[PDB]
Amino acid sequence: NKKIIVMMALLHKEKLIECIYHELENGGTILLLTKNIVVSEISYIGNTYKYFTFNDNHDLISKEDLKGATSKNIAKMIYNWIIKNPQNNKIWSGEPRTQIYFENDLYHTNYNHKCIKDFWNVSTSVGPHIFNDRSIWCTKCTSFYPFTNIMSPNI
Amino acid sequence: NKKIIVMMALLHKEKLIECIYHELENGGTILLLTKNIVVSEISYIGNTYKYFTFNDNHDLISKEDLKGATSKNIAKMIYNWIIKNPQNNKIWSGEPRTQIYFENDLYHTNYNHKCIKDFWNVSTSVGPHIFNDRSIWCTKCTSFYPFTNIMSPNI
Numbered sequence: 001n002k003k004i005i006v007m008m009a010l011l012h013k014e015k016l017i018e019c020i021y022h023e024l025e026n027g028g029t030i031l032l033l034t035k036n037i038v039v040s041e042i043s044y045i046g047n048t049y050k051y052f053t054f055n056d057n058h059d060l061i062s063k064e065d066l067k068g069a070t071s072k073n074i075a076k077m078i079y080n081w082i083i084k085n086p087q088n089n090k091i092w093s094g095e096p097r098t099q100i101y102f103e104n105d106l107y108h109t110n111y112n113h114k115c116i117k118d119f120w121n122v123s124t125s126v127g128p129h130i131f132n133d134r135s136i137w138c139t140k141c142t143s144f145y146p147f148t149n150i151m152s153p154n155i
Numbered sequence: 156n157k158k159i160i161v162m163m164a165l166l167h168k169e170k171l172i173e174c175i176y177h178e179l180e181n182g183g184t185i186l187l188l189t190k191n192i193v194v195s196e197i198s199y200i201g202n203t204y205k206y207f208t209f210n211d212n213h214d215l216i217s218k219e220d221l222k223g224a225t226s227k228n229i230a231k232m233i234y235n236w237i238i239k240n241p242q243n244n245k246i247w248s249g250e251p252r253t254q255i256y257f258e259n260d261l262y263h264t265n266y267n268h269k270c271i272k273d274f275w276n277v278s279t280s281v282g283p284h285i286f287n288d289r290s291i292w293c294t295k296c297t298s299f300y301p302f303t304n305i306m307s308p309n310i
């Protein structure tokens with residue numbers, strides 16, 4: 001049924017916006033990536049959200065005070081960006097840097113299970129880009145939102 | 156989010172009505188069971204659907220020509236009956252009798268796989284009630300709709 005395919009899309013929307021809303025209200029910062037290149041940033045600085053746009057040389061090319069813009073309205077703007085090009089448009093929520101350690105042909109965060117000991121000292125601080133391919137990540141300590149468009153590990 | 160819980164319930168409704176609608180348009184007969192006891196029957200006889208209500212002694216106590224009633228409108232009436240008491244109200248679609256055979260601590264229908272040989276002759280014709288507990292059926296030859304309220308095997 002077409003009505004069921006529409007209902008499924010509007011439900012996915014409501015759930016992905018709610019996910020983004022909560023991520024923005026918690027971490028206060030989201031990176032927008034197109035083909036695993038950061039193209040924008042929305043960060044709560046002061047008492048407002050600021051929308052930074054970057055060029056291919058990772059130079060700040062724009063800075064916009066979203067002023068009154070709510071977390072929920074920004075979440076909707078971010079979904080509208082994703083759904084236009086869902087195979088290439090992904091978002092990173094939180095501090096860009098993650099401590100990761102390689103062992104037994106898997107990469108580890110130690111988020112959902114302490115796979116690595118003295119992790120804090122044996123780990124390396126690494127940018128978001130490596131999380132684009134979920135296949136290399138340990139399924140015991142590293143979990144992700146069911147949404148393929150959220151690159152950042154859940155917790 | 157409450158709106159997501161409501162959207163999920165309306166989507167389950169649309170999917171379960173569409174499932175019932177198709178089952179009615181195919182087999183033309185549905186048994187309504189409450190605690191695995193047949194309490195009603197909707198069957199396409201002639202050019203209309205007829206609604207037979209039974210008592211605990213399986214006696215026809217009523218027969219109602221639904222007249223103009225469409226399969227979609229009847230599917231909706233059957234959903235409204237289910238969702239009132241979803242743990243006890245199930246439906247059987249098609250011929251009440253199914254050929255079943257016991258082997259290797261599993262019951263077989265030979266629907267999705269030829270589990271049994273000379274099945275047609277080694278099998279026994281059996282009412283719907285045994286399909287209430289899905290735990291006892293070969294998962295290779297016997298499949299059910301994801302909807303727990305449709306007792307009858309898919310195909």
Ligand SMILES: [Zn+2]
Pocket residue numbers: 107108109110113115116138139140141142
């Ligand atoms: Zn691990």
Ligand SMILES: [Zn+2]
Pocket residue numbers: 261262263264265268270271293294295296297
């Ligand atoms: Zn079988």
